[PDB]
Ligand binder design. Structure first.
Ligand SMILES: Nc1ncnc2c1ncn2[C@@H]1O[C@H](COP(=O)(O)CP(=O)(O)OP(=O)(O)O)[C@@H](O)[C@H]1O
Ligand SMILES: Cc1ccc(C(=O)CSc2nc3nc(N)[nH]c(=O)c3[nH]2)cc1
Ligand SMILES: [Ca+2]
Ligand SMILES: [Ca+2]
Ligand SMILES: [Ca+2]
Ligand SMILES: [Cl-]
Length: 159
């Protein structure tokens, strides 16, 4: 088994309902078990700001799936919860499931890049991650606690 850490975001179609449904669906992923769920946070949008605030959270999922097989499931869940692709970059969505980390693995395939390319620059990813995994060390040896101690991020407000 490996522990994967998944970021959850939603800012459309009742984010609390979307995230609760997503958590049930994550539980139903085969060869996998949810270990920990963060608090839910209400976060101002990064990127385009003309969209509603996000519900953000993080989940620890123990799994024996291959990383791309996990991605298959997370994409399926997003699509089954009505995620629609529009033209605008970084627009609102019913559900976003980003694979932040897959154990200590570094993955670079056509479909999957892990660690998530920008997670170390996003408070809405790092704070919920720290809530569920305060001892976390990244594949490059960087400590989550040290990033959050050193770098300026706004505090997150709970939903
Ligand atoms: N770690 C990861 N988790 C989830 N998807 C990933 C990924 N690495 C690459 N991808 C790929 O990312 C593609 C596009 O995903 P999108 O959800 O549209 C980007 P986003 O989440 O809105 O922005 P962001 O990546 O800046 O957070 C997916 O089709 C998937 O193949
Ligand atoms: C500079 C920059 C930084 C981050 C981002 C993104 O996170 C991609 S789109 C997005 N914006 C978001 N804002 C918040 N608060 N939460 C998200 O899940 C979320 N997803 C886009 C641009
Ligand atoms: Ca399961
Ligand atoms: Ca994202
Ligand atoms: Ca995504
Ligand atoms: Cl697999």
């Amino acid at each position: 088994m490996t522990v994967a850490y998944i970021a959850i975001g939603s800012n459309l179609a009742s984010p609390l309902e979307q995230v609760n449904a997503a958590l049930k669906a994550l539980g139903d992923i085969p060869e996998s078990h949810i270990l920990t769920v963060s608090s839910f946070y209400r976060t101002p949008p990064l990127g385009p700001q003309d969209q509603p605030d996000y519900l953000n959270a993080a989940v620890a999922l123990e799994t024996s799936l291959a990383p791309e097989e996990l991605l298959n499931h997370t994409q399926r869940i997003e699509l089954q919860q009505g995620r629609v692709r529009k033209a605008e970059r970084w627009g609102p969505r019913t559900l976003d499931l980003d694979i932040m980390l897959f154990g200590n693995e570094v993955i670079n395939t056509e479909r999957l890049t892990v660690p998530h390319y920008d997670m170390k620059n996003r408070g809405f990813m790092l704070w919920p991650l720290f809530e569920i995994a305060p001892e976390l060390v990244f594949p490059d040896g960087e400590m989550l606690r040290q990033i959050l101690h050193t770098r300026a991020f706004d505090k997150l407000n709970k939903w």
